[PDB]
């Protein structure tokens, strides 16, 4: 397995295009009918930063949970004692550029549990192999992953 390079995205097209994660349909807020489509991921082998102390980062689409859960396994296999960590997931409060897939519960920013930045290129490759529809080595501090809508 080859790490992603800095600022590399896979597939090599923009996130919201048909070959990647596809179109932004619209913001999901806590009242939405579409809010019911989000369910929480309480996998004990995934660390959630929970920046806002709401548990919001755990709420995500079905596809997102599936890929995230696959990645959790491969991370632990790659580096014994290390776990997948999510820094940001569903955003209810506009902490992104508009039309962010975080507003739809279809995108996570991730690290390893140990915050070892040298692992993140490999973590990105693991995310691709776990079946995330778009993976972007967005910064030294995290990888951005998203999935197609249900």
């Amino acid at each position, epitope marked *: 397995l080859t790490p992603l390079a*800095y*600022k590399q995205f896979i597939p090599n097209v923009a996130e919201k295009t048909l070959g990647a994660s596809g179109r932004y349909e619209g913001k999901i807020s806590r009242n939405s009918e579409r809010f019911k489509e989000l369910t929480p991921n309480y996998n004990p082998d995934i660390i959630f*930063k929970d*920046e806002e102390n709401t548990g919001a980062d755990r709420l995500m689409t079905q596809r997102c949970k599936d890929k995230l859960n696959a990645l959790a396994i491969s991370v632990m296999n790659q580096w014994p004692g290390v776990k997948l960590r999510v*820094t940001e997931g569903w955003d209810e*409060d*506009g*902490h992104h*550029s508009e039309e962010s897939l975080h507003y739809e519960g279809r995108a996570v*920013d991730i*690290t390893t549990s140990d*915050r070892d930045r040298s692992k993140y290129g490999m973590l990105a490759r693991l995310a691709v192999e776990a079946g995330f529809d778009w993976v972007y080595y*967005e*910064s*030294k*501090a*995290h990888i951005h992953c998203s999935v197609k809508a249900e």
Partner: antibody
Amino acid sequence: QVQLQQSGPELVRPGVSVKISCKGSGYTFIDEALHWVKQSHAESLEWIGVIRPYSGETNYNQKFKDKATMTVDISSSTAYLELARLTSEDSAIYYCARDWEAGDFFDYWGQGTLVTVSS
Amino acid sequence: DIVMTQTPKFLLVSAGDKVTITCKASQSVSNDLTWYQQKPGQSPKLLIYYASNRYTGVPDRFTGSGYGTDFTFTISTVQAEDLAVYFCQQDYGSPPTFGGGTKVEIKR
């Protein structure tokens, strides 16, 4: 509400050290990197270094390697910057500032501590 | 260490007019370019990161562009409250380094 509260302005003699403080509230202190930045006439803004409370890792700008020491007290949610062997070139405002793990840039800043080196 | 050259040093502009500030890095820094605003007496406030992404709550009139060495910060329709020094910062290289700033003054 995230807040970084720094210690007050300091008059300090040349050759002496000064220790300044930055207390974080309104978020989980240990979770985020804390950076220190110097603002002077001479050089506008300069990054001094970063401390990662969760690991105790420190990274210094080589230019401040022999000048600056960064520590933290988790129990009081306070980061400290010690500047040793002060000369007039150390007179400046010193800020602490946090990142939010999007990259090494800073949403929340302290109010700044003015350090005047003088006899 | 990467050097950030910011121009112009000073701008005079009427409320409603456009502001264009440039920062050039001494080597390519990807899109790892942050723009801050420092009003008088105050600490810097982050407006744009990754060259073009607005921070939470930052008004639409602020934009940024560029990838590599050459970056552009724009205030589309400058408001009275926008008087400040603006600074860029790169964090592609270590250490992070900042530009020397652009002071934006209002004509009335």
